[PDB]
Each structure stands twice: as C-alpha cells, then as structure tokens.
Design an enzyme around this catalytic site. Sequence first.
Site, PDB file in Angstrom:
ATOM      1  N   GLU A  75       0.814  -1.223   0.000  1.00  0.00           N
ATOM      2  CA  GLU A  75       0.000   0.000   0.000  1.00  0.00           C
ATOM      3  C   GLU A  75       0.851   1.278   0.000  1.00  0.00           C
ATOM      4  O   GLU A  75       0.761   2.109   0.915  1.00  0.00           O
ATOM      5  CB  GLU A  75      -1.018   0.032   1.165  1.00  0.00           C
ATOM      6  CG  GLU A  75      -1.974  -1.170   1.276  1.00  0.00           C
ATOM      7  CD  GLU A  75      -3.192  -1.112   0.334  1.00  0.00           C
ATOM      8  OE1 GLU A  75      -3.096  -0.485  -0.745  1.00  0.00           O
ATOM      9  OE2 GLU A  75      -4.251  -1.710   0.674  1.00  0.00           O
ATOM     10  N   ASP A  76       1.654   1.429  -1.047  1.00  0.00           N
ATOM     11  CA  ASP A  76       2.510   2.601  -1.223  1.00  0.00           C
ATOM     12  C   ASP A  76       3.379   2.893  -0.002  1.00  0.00           C
ATOM     13  O   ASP A  76       3.531   4.044   0.413  1.00  0.00           O
ATOM     14  CB  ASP A  76       1.690   3.831  -1.619  1.00  0.00           C
ATOM     15  CG  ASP A  76       1.072   3.704  -3.003  1.00  0.00           C
ATOM     16  OD1 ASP A  76       1.784   3.297  -3.956  1.00  0.00           O
ATOM     17  OD2 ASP A  76      -0.141   4.010  -3.128  1.00  0.00           O
TER      18      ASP A  76
END
Lengths: 114, 44, 266, 134, 65
Positions: free
Chosen positions: D3-4
Amino acid sequence: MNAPDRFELFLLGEGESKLKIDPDTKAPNAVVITFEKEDHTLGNLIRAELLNDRKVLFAAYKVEHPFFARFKLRIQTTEGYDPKDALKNACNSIINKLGALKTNFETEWNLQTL
Amino acid sequence: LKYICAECSSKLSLSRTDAVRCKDCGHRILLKARTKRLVQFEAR
Amino acid sequence: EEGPQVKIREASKDNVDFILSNVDLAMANSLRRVMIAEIPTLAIDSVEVETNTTVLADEFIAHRLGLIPLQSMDIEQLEYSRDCFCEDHCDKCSVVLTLQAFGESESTTNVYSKDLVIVSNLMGRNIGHPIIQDKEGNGVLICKLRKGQELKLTCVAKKGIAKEHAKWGPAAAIEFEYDPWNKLKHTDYWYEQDSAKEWPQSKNCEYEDPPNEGDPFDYKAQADTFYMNVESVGSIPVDQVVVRGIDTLQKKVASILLALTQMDQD
Amino acid sequence: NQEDSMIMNQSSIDRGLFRSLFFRSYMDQEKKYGMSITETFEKPQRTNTLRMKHGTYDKLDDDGLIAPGVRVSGEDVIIGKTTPISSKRDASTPLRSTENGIVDQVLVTTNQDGLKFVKVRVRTTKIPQIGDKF
Amino acid sequence: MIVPVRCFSCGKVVGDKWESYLNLLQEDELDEGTALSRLGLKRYCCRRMILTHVDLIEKFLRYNP
Ligand SMILES: [Zn+2]
Ligand SMILES: [Zn+2]
Ligand SMILES: [Zn+2]
C-alpha cells in the site's frame, strides 16, 4: 527519535537469558525455545540440521517481528529422546562441519598464488 | 568576547556599547566564533 | 579432509572465487550472512573536532571518517570498549588518531586518509592503520581545503560489528550461486518465447553437466554445490573474511551449547 | 512494503544514502519602542527576573547568545533577552520543543534603525527513518 | 558534495577512486565506461556511485571566507 539503539540486536538486556525453554502444551514431547538476540543466521542453521536427525519429528523456527532480534525454535522428538539433546547434537553437528570447513579451506588457500 | 568579522578575518573582541561594525573594514555584520567546550560526534 | 569441501578457482589480495561442495544450503547461507554482518573490525567511532573552517559540516566529515577502512588484522586482541573496565576509552580497546590539515597553497589542498596519524599506543598489535590500495598512496579523499582553511580533529577507532553499523563491515560483495541449470527447479523462468535463448548462461555452467531431455525430473536431489566469491574491503585479508566468518558462526553456535549447560544448574 | 510504502536497505543507509543536512535559523531583536525603553540581550538570572522558561540558560554566554559549538536540544534557551518593565521580564527564545542539534553560526549585527539584532542558526543531520516520504 | 567514502549498496570503497577517474577521462582520453572499468568498478551497484556523482565542493571552495 523513537529508534532503539543498534547494539540491542546482539547485546542482551536487563535479565534476558539467551535461551528460554518451555514445554509445548499442544503435542506431547515437544518444546519451544526462545533465542534472544539472534536471527535467521542462527535459527535457519539449527532448524536445517535438526532435520537430518531421524528421531526428530518436527522442527521449525520463526521471527515473530523483524523489529526484534529474537526467534522461536519448536522441537518435537520421538518418545524417550529428550528434545534438548536433539538441540545439543544438532549444534555440535554443525560445529564439526564448520571446523572441517575451516581447515579444508585453509589447505586450499595455502596452495594458491596472487 | 571575540567576533570574527564578515568580509574581514579577525577576532574583534569588542563588547556592548562598542556597537558595530568592526576594525579596518567598513562592513557591519559580525559572526560569533566557535566555542571552546568541544563537542563529540558518533562517527555514524 | 572430511565433510564440507572447498576448491579455490581464483585468488587475490581482494578476492576468493571458490566452490563449497558437500554442505547444507542453510550453512552455506548462514556463512555468507556472518561474513557480511558479524566478523568484527576496528573503525573510527568518535570524532572530537577542534577546528573545522572547511566547506563541509562537522558531522558530515565525522561520517566519512567512520567509513575509512582501518587495518583490523590483529583485531581479536583489541577489546570492546563496552567490555573493558576503563572509563570511556583506553589503549586495550581503542586506537586514537589525529588529523591535521591546513591549506597552504593557492591550489586546492586535498586531505587523504594517508594524512591520518595514529597516536595511541598500538603496543605491537597490527591495527588502526588506514588501508591504502590507492595507486599513488593516498587512499580515500576525506576533504578539500581552500586557502585559509583549517581542519583539526581527533578520532577514536573502536572494535565494532557490521550489525551495529555498516562501517564495520569486512565484506564488500559476496557472489553466491547454486544449481546453474535449474536442475532443482528452484525458479520458474519468466520468458516470452524461449527460456533458454533469453536468459543468459551463468559462467558456472562449464562446471556442471547440462540436463538431458531424455531424463525426467530428479526430485530426490538437493542443493549441494555452491559457487561463491568473497570480495574484501581490506581491513582484513580475503582468506580471513571467510575463515573468521566460519570461526564466528561456529563461535556463536557454541555459546548456545554452553548456554544449555548454564541452565541445567539447580 | 504494501500500500505505497517501501522497504529501505538499512545497511546502505549507514553509508549515507538519502542523508540530509538541516539548518534552522532563529531570530530576535532589541526592542522597537520607547526612548528610555530597550530590551537587552543578556543571560538573565531567575533572581526576581520572572518570566523564566523551563529550559536551562546555562548554554548562554555572557552576551545572551550560544556559541557556534554547543549541542542544543529540548527547550534549551538559545537567545537570552529581557524586557525591562517598570526589575525585568524574560523574552528569551527556546530551541523548538521537538528539535535538537548543534549551533552552526551566530550573527550579531545592527538593523537599519540602529537596533542590535541576532540570527542564530542550528544544524541537524537527518537520516532516513521509518515513515519518511520518498 | 564530495566523492563517497563507500558505495551505499555493496560496501566497496569508492572514495580513493575519484581523482584516478578524472585522470583516466581527460589525461588519456578514455570513455567513462572504460574509465570506470579500469578503476575495477565492475558491478553496476558501485559503478553508478562514481558516474552519477557531482563534485559540488569545487564550487563551495570558490567562496572566500
Ligand atoms: Zn572587517
Ligand atoms: Zn578501554
Ligand atoms: Zn557498490
């Protein structure tokens, strides 16, 4: 600012034993040792050698969180064979391979040039 | 105490009521000088 | 000799290309790890600075100082400062060195690691001397001075482990490869048209026998042969990185053994 | 690294990967009001001189300013100044509560009205920690 | 700023290589890839440490103080 010191990876702390042995409650004749201030360097080596002992039913280690240098080794042995001995023979077995490895390397090195 | 000049290298140890600028320059703008109580650095 | 088996292919001051037969994967791995993070070394780990009118910042310099490779051959007879009973540092546990540089010339004055000057009492131990593989004898470019610039500082080298900071890292690169024809199917090659024509051949393929399509999958086989290459920074000769590596690994396996006996007491 | 987020090589970091210098400049000035009124740069003493902070002034030289070597941290007073209201009232400048570092340079100069004023600049090196955006 | 005491990735010492690099370039007219190879910078993890590096110090010394 919130980081732990880096020695905390190999230096033990205020009353932290190196090994901690606990009787596994699930399966009979099984034990779960906690190794403070160690990692995959050790754990993977002990667990892979415990897998060669043919009286070891079960053997596996795990780092429950990478933040912390520590890991759990779980060992189950056949009836009558105390698991600690399974660990002991295991370590020694490694030490002997390592020694042989060192000398074997040395003689090889002493034959070279440049 | 001292205060190394800007466009001029010196230790004009001038105090208050002496005001700026400095000696033998003409440009007011005084930097303080390094302390004596030496500091340490972890080489990390 | 007996078990695990070594075969040097190439050797040099800086590299040992070898083959490590008859060993567990686990062990050949655990050795490479230890070689990276756990054979101890001496490296600058404190800088008291007296004057720095240089273009660079204090700690910015202090940093580079840490990275300069110091002779760590006799390191095993120097002590961990944390261990040694003196207050702060001493001569048993720490080398101290001095750096003085002042720009005299019009031309830019450089500061090399040759300009480092040992000051504490080495007492015979082969220790603390900056490694210099540089050709003109001034390894590592610490800093640059203009005309009136000065830099005066004192560095206390300590025994350290790369786990604690990568400065104390004796190994540079540790090449490592097994089963160069995927005969164990340990990867599944990504391809477009042809695995074989697209993935280039590992140099370690002249050393093993190519598989036969007339043969099926050998499923019983294990990983056995290992093609490593240890490259050393120089604070410890090559041969020693591997040896001390095997030594340290073994050493720490041991403290586990001993620790089991420590618990048995009533 | 889901998630980034990302995973950074701690080893590489030590050899100075994505390291920055960080300089902050604090600034103060002697009064701006009166003919018989003038705030003074000095190291005040808690003797009657109320308005004292929580941090130590102990790093202030006699002229009310730190020297370009001193490590500062927490709420260390950096610039000492008193506003004499009829003994004194404190007007000293604490180092930013959450910061910490080493004094880099101190600029004492006059201002266009003949006001003595000061620019203190502190220095931190900042090494890529967990949670730093790249 | 100034050459790197060491490569971030591997750990190799690239700090003694700077001047020797600049000479291989201009003195004997080599090209940066060849120059980088003669300095024995083989693996590209440490190869870019030198090629991609910018010597801002040369500019910093320009200031009198
Ligand atoms: Zn002047
Ligand atoms: Zn000592
Ligand atoms: Zn590299």
